[PDB]
Amino acid sequence: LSRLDPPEAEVQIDRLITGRLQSLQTYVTQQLIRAAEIRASANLAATKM
Amino acid sequence: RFASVYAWNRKRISNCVADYSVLYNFAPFFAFKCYGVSPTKLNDLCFTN
C-alpha cells in the first residue's frame, strides 16, 4: 500500500487474495474428511458400548 | 561536465531531508519511468542512502 500507486497496487494485492483463499480451502476440505472418519469411529464405539 | 559510460562516477547522498517534488523543475524530462516504487509517493519513505 505504501510503495505502489493504486492502478498496480490493486493487481499486486489481488495475487495474494487468491493464494490465501486456496490455502484456506484445503484446510476445511481435509477437516471434512477427518470429521467423517471420526464419525465412523464414534458410531463403532457406540455400537460396541 | 559528465563522465563517459565506461567511467561512470558514483555520488553518495546522506544526512539530509529529500523532497522529490523539486527535481522536476531542474530538467525538462516528462517520462520518469520508475521500477520498484511509484514516483507519486517517494516523499513518505525513509531510505538508508
Q: How far is CA A38 from CA A3, A33, B3, B21, in A?
A: 48, 9, 75, 64
Residue A13, C-alpha cell as written in the block: 494485492
Please give the Cα distance from B32 to B19 (Å, whole number).
16
SS3 content of chain A, % helix, strand, coil (to 5): 90, 0, 10
Q: Which of B33, B35, B41, B43 to mutate to test the interface with A (most CBs of A within 10 A)?
A: B41
Resolution of the experimental model, in Å, one decimal: 3.5
Cβ distance A7 to B49 under 8 Å?
no
Cβ distance B5 to B24 under 8 Å?
no
Strands (E) across chain A are located at none
Cβ distance B45 to A2 under 8 Å?
yes
Q: Which of A5, A8, A10, A12 to mutate to test the interface with B (most CBs of B within 10 A)?
A: A5
CB contact under 8 A, B45 and A4: no
Residues with Cβ within 8 Å of B45's Cβ and at least 6 positions away in sequence, in order, are A2, A3, B37
